[PDB]
Symmetry: C2
Subunit: 406 residues, 2 copies
């Protein structure tokens, strides 16, 4: 029998990803033990079934050890551990597994920077994380197991899972994305590039600088339809947080084009509405005097610095004429290096349906195809896998449910 041990944490996603990295390096344990200091208090289900789809029939047992060091000296030797993974735990928990433990092998998966992780499995490229046997300091290679007992080709994935799907398929060989075309983009394709990050505005740097100074932001309708969920990364800072206010006028304009004929014009507003819903307004469709007026009203009533973000040059110039500090997205930059491929595919899938079945190909053979399916405030894409051996989105669906519950 092969016994695998790992550590529990408050963010169980790290423990989940630690196990999956252990699975994807060839290990097929008969039993997996998660050592955690405190009771779980959050029933998590589906890992056994998800592991079944990956050709691993294992039992997952949670062993609550307790809080304290001497307590971990004694109770960590009780089990006959074969391979011990010590990545997602506490420092002292990881150290308490190297010492006083009968584990034959102890390994750790290292990530270049710790901050990119803590999300769904496969989002981080596998070139940036490598599992290391801490005893001898070598890199054990990957051999990703294929999916078994695959029932449904269709699956529901968010943006992160779609990017994870691309990265996981990269382990097997060359993964090409056919049908993208691009070349000479139209009006909708241009904003699709902006939302993905392939196109950026030179004034996006101004948003970062103003975010560092701790200033309120009000974003125009075109900002949500062109920057999308990238507004979260542009505005968020550790010191002050997410200081992007929810404009009523922007919501009103998005709502008017959302509630009814799905033309290319309507696609822009639906994309902005999904971003608007995701960014703020966590849970009032009344009239408003406009984006400029609401910035002026807040400016005279608070001591915070009010900044107005817009892609409408006429609106931005008028806002500056009233004294407001305005960031006007005018200059366009190409070749930014890094962008979210998942956001690009999400926009292009939606755009293609209202203009071409764009597919994901591996080694010159089509593997999966995707379409756009929207209902309420859900940024979900349905991908259908035509290859029964690579139906990883089914596992990603289970993981997404696990992460959402946590």
């Amino acid at each position: 029998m092969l016994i695998l041990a790992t550590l529990g944490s408050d963010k169980s996603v790290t423990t989940i990803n630690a196990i999956l990295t252990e699975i994807f390096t060839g290990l097929n344990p008969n039993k997996i033990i998660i050592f955690r200091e405190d009771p779980q208090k959050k029933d998590i289900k589906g890992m056994e079934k998800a592991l079944e789809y990956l050709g691993v029939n294992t039992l997952i047992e949670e062993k609550v050890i307790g809080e304290g060091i001497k307590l971990w000296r004694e109770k960590i030797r009780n089990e006959e551990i074969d391979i011990f993974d010590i990545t997602p735990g506490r420092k002292y928990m990881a150290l308490s597994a190297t010492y006083y433990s009968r584990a034959e092998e102890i390994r750790y998966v290292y990530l270049k920077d710790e901050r990119e992780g803590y999300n769904i499995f496969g989002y981080v490229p596998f070139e940036q994380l490598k599992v290391i046997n801490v005893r001898i300091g070598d890199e054990i290679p990957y051999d990703p197991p294929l999916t078994q007992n695959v029932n449904e080709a269709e699956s529901l994935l968010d943006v992160d899972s779609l990017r994870a799907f691309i990265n996981i398929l990269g382990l097997h060989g060359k993964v090409e994305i056919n049908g993208i075309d691009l070349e000479n983009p139209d009006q909708v394709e241009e904003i699709c590039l902006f939302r993905s990050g392939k196109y950026k505005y030179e004034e996006e740097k101004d948003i970062i600088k103003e975010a560092e100074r701790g200033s309120l932001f009000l974003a125009d309708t075109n900002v949500y339809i062109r920057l999308g969920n990238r507004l979260r990364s542009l505005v968020y800072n550790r010191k002050y947080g997410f200081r992007l206010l929810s404009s009523k006028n922007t919501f009103n304009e998005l709502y008017n084009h959302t509630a009814q004929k799905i033309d290319e014009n309507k696609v822009k507003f639906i994309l902005g509405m999904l971003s608007y819903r995701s960014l703020h307004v966590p849970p009032r469709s009344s009239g408003d005097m406009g984006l400029i007026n609401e910035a002026l009203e807040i400016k005279k009533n608070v001591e915070d610095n009010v900044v107005l973000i817009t892609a409408d040059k006429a609106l931005g110039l008028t806002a500056q004429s009233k004294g407001l500090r305005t960031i006007i997205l005018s200059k366009v930059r190409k070749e930014i290096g890094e962008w979210d491929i998942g956001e690009l595919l999400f926009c292009l899938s939606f755009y293609n349906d209202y203009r071409r079945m764009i597919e994901i190909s591996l080694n010159g053979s089509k593997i999966a195809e995707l379409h756009s399916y929207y209902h309420l405030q859900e940024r979900r894409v349905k991908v259908r896998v035509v290859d029964k051996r690579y139906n990883y989105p089914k596992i990603l669906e289970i993981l997404s449910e696990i992460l959402a519950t946590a």
Copy 2:
């Protein structure tokens, strides 16, 4: 020669606290080596002098090893370390220090709660953190070294350093503060310290979890103090307390005559919290424009944004009127006593300011006076001048150096 080694981190405070914990457990190293994966890029000065004040004349050397496990495999064997501390590392550096290193003894500082750290040395009570010899797994006892070559008894400490001073003195023995029936100013001191809380503070936490905008009244800043940041801040949404113009106007009007009466003490105390909590972009205290009031500005923000606007006030008449206009108002009326843990530094700071404008509070160890403190305020500085009558326990002098380093690290 005695050689001490530790690991470098992006937050150098963890490395600093690891060394000082090793100093306070009796270690007197002749040379201190900090192994880091990347270049420092932020010069730290004054640390050598702080170790001198504790009777340690040591050399502090930064040895950049590099990134990688195989790279750390070779370059960590160069030094003949005597004692290696592996608390402030990033696991793989700690493992690369446990393995492939000729350190005679390796120890690790354990903390009960992971988030209580990342602050000045001594802020966390020493009963919650213990240094452990990981080779055999026992607790290395404390023998706090005495201060040496201390020239000036008087020193300036902030709220965190004042708590650190009490906790550090706690290692030597029982530390009593020889300084009931509170008056109006003493009541708000209890509220700000955390000994007194309002039952409606739970509503602030719930609204913070719901992701709602906050506007706080003048009495909120003078009574809740800097705990308002903890009540509003949440990991998902952040610090969502807007800076009221009218509230600053009321505080500014009462801060600028000449005699500091009991009324002025409350407003300047609230002003200190107001500048510390928010208004980071706008600076100084000049030219605040007029406003129609806290209620009107809440209505104006409510009618222009889709966020949930919540008004915080201790004025029941104001809160009820705001509620009658539809605003979600949290009215601080009910008082909770015996809430468990409180900020001792804020308590002494609040009591020090009111006492200087109304006895003589002292800090005593085992029945013998150790230090006395007084109130000295200037702009956005919550500093208390404490004079130590025993040169053998002049720990605030070291705490001043640590506070400067922490301020330099976080611009």
